[PDB]
């Protein structure tokens, strides 16, 4: 018959790594998670307790509960036509802080800092990010860079 256990189809997902087996380096147990922190979920296959389900590998959530060894994570999961709020009790080895979250907080401070400098003089700092713009006009000098003319090559075997 068919087989759908808890860890079915997890052969490579929960595989440890190449030359990264054994004990976990302790910085993962030194990281601190507060309620509201944005965390990623990458299950560590060596630690079998507090393991996320395979659905939650690669999912990013928000901490809502902090216990002795684990954090409660809220994750939005798509069930049918709507997202359901799921609550994961995950041990710290299976989570890490989202790096994009930390980068945006630096932008928040950088935006506030830039506003403070501009407010001293009113130079329209324009904190808002912009998409890559079409190139402006430029002049290409040819001195020392004479154009080298190219043609399609003939066909040949090379075997």
């Amino acid at each position: 018959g068919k087989s759908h256990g808890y860890r079915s189809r997890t052969r490579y997902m929960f595989q440890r790594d190449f030359r990264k087996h054994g004990a976990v380096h302790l910085s993962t147990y030194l990281k601190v998670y507060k309620v509201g922190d944005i965390v990623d979920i990458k299950a560590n296959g060596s630690i079998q307790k507090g393991m996320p389900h395979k659905f939650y590998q690669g999912k990013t959530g928000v901490v809502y509960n902090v216990t002795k060894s684990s954090v409660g994570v809220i994750i939005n999961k798509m069930v049918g036509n709507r997202y359901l709020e799921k609550r994961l009790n995950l041990r710290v080895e299976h989570i890490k802080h989202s790096k994009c979250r930390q980068e945006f907080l630096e932008r928040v401070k950088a935006n506030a800092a830039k506003r403070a400098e501009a407010k001293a003089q009113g130079v329209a700092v324009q904190l808002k990010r912009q998409p890559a713009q079409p190139r402006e006009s430029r002049i290409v000098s040819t001195e020392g860079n004479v154009p080298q003319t190219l043609a399609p090559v003939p066909y040949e075997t090379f075997i």
Binding site: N65, T67, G72, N76, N81, Y83, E85
Partner: protein, 58 residues
């Protein structure tokens, strides 16, 4: 007589008719599922702030 066994055909289309809206977010989530030791202490701390605030704006 054999029938069709399973297909997810048309299921994504059905789920998008009035569909995939995110769950509505609130200020003050429910404190169910959070540690009772924190919950019990939070109750006392919130009580004191209401008493402390009431004294200030008497």
């Amino acid at each position: 007589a054999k029938s069709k066994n399973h297909t997810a055909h048309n299921q994504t289309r059905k789920a998008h008719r009035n569909g995939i809206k995110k769950p509505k977010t609130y200020k003050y989530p429910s404190l169910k599922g959070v540690d009772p030791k924190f919950r019990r202490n939070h109750k006392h701390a919130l009580h004191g702030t209401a008493k402390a605030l009431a004294a200030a704006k008497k």
